[PDB]
């Protein structure tokens, strides 16, 4: 009918079994699907705009797009070891560099 990222099988089977968000689907995230180096992560409803997030593949990302369900991450490193179901910790510090 229509496409949503709450009609994904992992999301639906956890809600039906009465599992909640639990700061894992609210702050942190988990990858739903990543392709074209554009990971889309489920959770992170508390997040700032273009905030730095750290994956379990070693790769870091930015959030150009904050959409309702997903937060559409763009990955800065290679895709080689990046995959589905990763925890994507919220670094909680917007992208920054040393000044001095």
């Amino acid at each position: 009918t229509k496409a949503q990222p709450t009609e994904v099988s992992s999301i639906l089977e956890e809600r039906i079994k009465g599992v909640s968000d639990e700061a894992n689907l609210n702050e942190t995230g988990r990858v739903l699907a990543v392709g074209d180096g554009i990971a889309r992560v489920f959770g992170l409803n508390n997040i700032q705009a273009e905030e730095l997030v750290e994956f379990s593949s070693g790769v870091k990302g930015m959030a150009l797009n904050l959409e309702p369900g997903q937060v559409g991450i763009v990955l800065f490193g290679s895709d080689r070891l990046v995959k589905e179901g990763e925890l994507v910790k919220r670094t909680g510090n917007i992208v920054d560099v040393p000044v001095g």
Partner: protein, 187 residues
């Protein structure tokens, strides 16, 4: 987990609903209680069939679910969580779809298939029983995929029959033989 994915449109739900009940260890009950409730929603006097397209609030919808779970107190707590998901996504135009989809998954786990043996006009009862015997002898019905023969009447069958089950058909209809006979004699 799914007992293989079947149905792309609204089979995504049916898959969830099924994988959640496999860990409960009662899928059959779930299906049964949902089935009886699915009917009693449909046969609601005013606003059975007449409200299926949402034009209200997600919150007004949530209260449509709430009033439904009063109609029967046996529905299981997992199909109660399915309703929430449906109320919140605001879908009720393919509500009975999930229920049927769930039946197809469910009754494959039972080892029943629901076949049809469409004809021009009803065949004999000895014909039916001979066809079910015949299918069981063959490998088209392997067991665990056991048709229940439902005769349906189709005016575009000009004689003969077409037998149906799974993705397997044996077609000795007259409509096909005449269509082909005609074409060559005008080719």
């Amino acid at each position: 987990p799914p007992p293989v994915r079947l149905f792309g449109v609204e089979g995504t739900y049916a898959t969830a609903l099924y994988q959640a009940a496999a860990k409960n260890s009662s899928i059959d009950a779930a299906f049964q209680s949902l089935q009886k409730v699915e009917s009693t929603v449909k046969k609601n006097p005013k606003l059975g069939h007449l409200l299926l397209n949402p034009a209200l609030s997600l919150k007004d919808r949530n209260s449509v679910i709430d009033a439904i779970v009063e109609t029967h107190k046996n529905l299981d707590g997992y199909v109660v969580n399915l309703l929430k998901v449906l109320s919140e996504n605001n879908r009720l135009g393919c509500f009975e779809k999930i229920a049927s989809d769930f039946g197809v998954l469910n009754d494959a786990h039972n080892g029943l298939l629901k076949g049809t043996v469409t004809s021009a006009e009803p065949l004999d009862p000895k014909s039916f029983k001979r066809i079910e015997k015949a299918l069981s002898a063959s490998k088209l019905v392997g067991q665990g995929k056991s048709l229940k023969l439902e005769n349906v009447v189709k005016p575009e069958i000009k004689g003969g029959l077409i037998v149906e089950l799974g993705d397997k058909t044996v077609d000795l209809s007259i409509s096909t033989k005449i269509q082909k006979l005609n074409k060559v004699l005008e080719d």
